[PDB]
Amino acid sequence: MSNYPLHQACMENEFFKVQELLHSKPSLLLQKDQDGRIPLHWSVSFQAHEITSFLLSKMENVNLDDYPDDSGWTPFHIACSVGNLEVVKSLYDRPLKPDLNKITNQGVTCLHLAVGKKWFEVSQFLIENGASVRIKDKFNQIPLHRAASVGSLKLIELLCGLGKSAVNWQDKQGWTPLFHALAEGHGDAAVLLVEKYGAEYDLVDNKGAKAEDVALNEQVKKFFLNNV
């Protein structure tokens, strides 16, 4: 089986080809390649709307959750990381909807994937249909850790605000969302935590440092204390 054309067909977006390959051999619709991925996977990865939508029609009794690739990534996972609200809404509004909290091999939820990349719609959409804003991945990291890391106040005010997110949890390295949003130097972001969403800042990582000590550069640091 070395080559899996149907999947390929999904990568290259040859809508017909696909519709033509399913015709010849039906057992392909739900076949898993050397990555544990089924067609739908790739048809979502590259955003093949027509192919996708179609592919689904014959997967309407198929639970997305039951199809995670070799990294626990589900066609709804790939969907959320990519950033297309449509494609996601597509995979969501169906008889059997996917678990918004199912994690991947390294335990990250679509909220992380979404937040990390900064997909406000996606992030928000999810939060609205459940999606725990508090799921720790194999690094004791929750979406806010991601949000602060990049530093989007926009998503910081969403997780912490609406999603009443916890803000003082520390990952493995022993870092609160604040350290992150300071090591990458997002002063304004850092302060928003402490200031608007009461984030403690006297804690120390698993080495003895506080958020101030693990800041990007002095320019950053100062702006912090000079405003906390």
Partner: protein
């Protein structure tokens, strides 16, 4: 070569946010070969995590 649209390299950096630019090169490179064997060009998360492992501590 290139990263799969859904790849999540951020996750990889944000873990211990303190990696020498050289490991990044090694991590990134290893993840290239893993993707190579799977006879694919684009890189998946599988490759990266498996690269991060045999490349850090």
């Amino acid at each position: 070569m290139s990263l799969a649209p859904e790849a999540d390299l951020d996750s990889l950096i944000i873990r211990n946010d303190s990696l020498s630019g050289a490991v990044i090169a090694a991590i990134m490179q290893e993840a290239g070969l893993r993707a190579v064997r799977k006879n694919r060009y684009v890189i998946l998360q599988s490759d990266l995590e498996e690269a991060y492992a045999t490349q850090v501590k």
